[PDB]
Amino acid sequence: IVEGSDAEIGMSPWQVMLFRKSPQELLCGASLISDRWVLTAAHCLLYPPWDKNFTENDLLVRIGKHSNIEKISMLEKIYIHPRYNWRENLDRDIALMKLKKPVAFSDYIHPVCLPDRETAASLLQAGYKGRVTGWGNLRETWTTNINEIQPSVLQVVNLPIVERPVCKDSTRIRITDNMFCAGYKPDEGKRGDACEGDSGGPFVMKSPFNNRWYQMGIVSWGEGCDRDGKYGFYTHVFRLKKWIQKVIDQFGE
Amino acid sequence: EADCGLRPLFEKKSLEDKTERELLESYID
Numbered sequence A: 001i002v003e004g005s006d007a008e009i010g011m012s013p014w015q016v017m018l019f020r021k022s023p024q025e026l027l028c029g030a031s032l033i034s035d036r037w038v039l040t041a042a043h044c045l046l047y048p049p050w051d052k053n054f055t056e057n058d059l060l061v062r063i064g065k066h067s068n069i070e071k072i073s074m075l076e077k078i079y080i081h082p083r084y085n086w087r088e089n090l091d092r093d094i095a096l097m098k099l100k101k102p103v104a105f106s107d108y109i110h111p112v113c114l115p116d117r118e119t120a121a122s123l124l125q126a127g128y129k130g131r132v133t134g135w136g137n138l139r140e141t142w143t144t145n146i147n148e149i150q151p152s153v154l155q156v157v158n159l160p161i162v163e164r165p166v167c168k169d170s171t172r173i174r175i176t177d178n179m180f181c182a183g184y185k186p187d188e189g190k191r192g193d194a195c196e197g198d199s200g201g202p203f204v205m206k207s208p209f210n211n212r213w214y215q216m217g218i219v220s221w222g223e224g225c226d227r228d229g230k231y232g233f234y235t236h237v238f239r240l241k242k243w244i245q246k247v248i249d250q251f252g253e
Numbered sequence B: 001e002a003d004c005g006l007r008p009l010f011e012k013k014s015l016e017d018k019t020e021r022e023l024l025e026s027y028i029d
């Protein structure tokens, strides 16, 4: 996360980290949506142009991490959207990971809500801010050392959703309805973005109707990090929820 | 939904985090 701040303890208890099992390597962010299901970006698990094609047995997740607070879980199975377009523009960039066994909730481990139609309709508006969290790089590039851009605490940044014409205008990539973009404009002064390692992590919004946090996005792709006139692109969670529900209904008994 | 989206250290204790108001203000302005 670029231009964010240290998360407060328990601020993002649905936060999940996706790791290569052995040897160890932080791969992506993710989010906890029930005691057994984790949501992430498809490209975190399957991306042939970088020779990426992980199975359940290649991976571990970490949950409840801020900085015995923290839980390590194995995966039973991975499910990637059947119409995820890795060849072109990362359309439908979404995947589910089923934990080997359910996790117990605590003060530091608690699931985020998935939006329904009404919440998505109300809140997915230009200028409305959501929140992105992750263990990704603090800047696109480092000046003194490799570790000056790796954070010691979970990072948080609030970013406004951007007008669709501005999103589309900002890139040559064909963007679809299954993507939205977020971030400040050059003239707005304020800054912030996801960066390397934040992919797959959540873009959340707090409902004014019921004061619950809802995951509206999944960190998907960008062009560099925190560049003037560029925006982060996020998978539109609600637009793909029937698929999420189909997977949980089929494989979640 | 169960208790989804309600944080044990925040909503459940009637505490606000340091920047959530900024999010809600953007919806209302």
Ligand SMILES: *[C@@H]1O[C@H](CO)[C@@H](O)[C@H](O)[C@H]1NC(C)=O
Pocket: A046, A048, A053
């Ligand atoms: C890994 O290979 C392909 C690469 O596109 C991927 O779609 C698939 O999930 C994996 N292979 C098989 C045989 O399932």
Ligand code: NA
Pocket: A183, A184, A193, A226, A227, A228, A229, A230, A231
């Ligand atoms: Na930008």
Ligand code: NA
Pocket: B026, B027, B028, B029
């Ligand atoms: Na409004």
